[PDB]
């Protein structure tokens with residue numbers, strides 16, 4: 102993410118890092134000892150999930166099953182969500198904790214934050230997790246930002262002052278509002294930066310029932 106700074110070691114216990122063949126690929130959110138949520142465009146073979154990373158608190162697991170939303174549309178990023186079934190149950194340890202979903206699509210909090218190990222503004226990739234406060238942007242204003250591209254399955258969020266924004270390598274990471282999972286990093290402007298066009302996030306509240314069915318099955 103661009104224009105933020107390093108999170109506190111204790112302020113991000115739900116954050117996952119997703120690797121493929123030894124390369125950082127995406128972020129992700131622990132939402133249940135056995136399940137990580139991320140973006141559907143993060144589907145790759147040979148996935149490795151690292152939890153409790155920012156190391157002693159860290160833990161690593163293979164993926165047993167990667168369930169892409171049935172209706173994911175790659176060209177438009179509509180329905181950009183994936184569930185990952187961990188081989189090894191997560192060891193909850195205060196540096197590793199699930200995050201509750203936002204279940205109400207009309208929740209009023211518009212002050213949020215984002216997190217990831219994706220690209221910083223200098224085009225580099227950081228060893229330490231980055232954080233930024235941003236705000237939700239109204240659907241109408243986001244539709245104007247990107248005509249023909251914002252569905253009910255997405256939410257927009259950004260920062261008019263400094264342009265704080267997610268970026269490549271942040272995909273699947275959490276948009277957190279009122280300490281609930283509101284969104285997943287999905288797509289946005291390139292070069293990354295939100296002073297003109299907001300970041301676009303998968304609208305997590307619309308997937309409560311699909312998440313519930315997949316886990317509980």
Ligand SMILES: CC[C@H](NC(=O)[C@H]1CN(c2ccc(C(=N)N)nc2)C(=O)O1)c1cccc2ccccc12
Pocket residue numbers: 125126127142143266267268269270271272286287288289290291292293294299300301
């Ligand atoms: C799964 C591959 C990975 N895909 C992405 O990161 C997606 C997310 N995204 C993007 C763009 C802008 C914003 C925003 N402005 N809010 N948010 C997300 C893209 O443009 O592509 C990837 C793409 C390109 C370089 C990478 C380098 C290292 C690791 C992963 C990389």
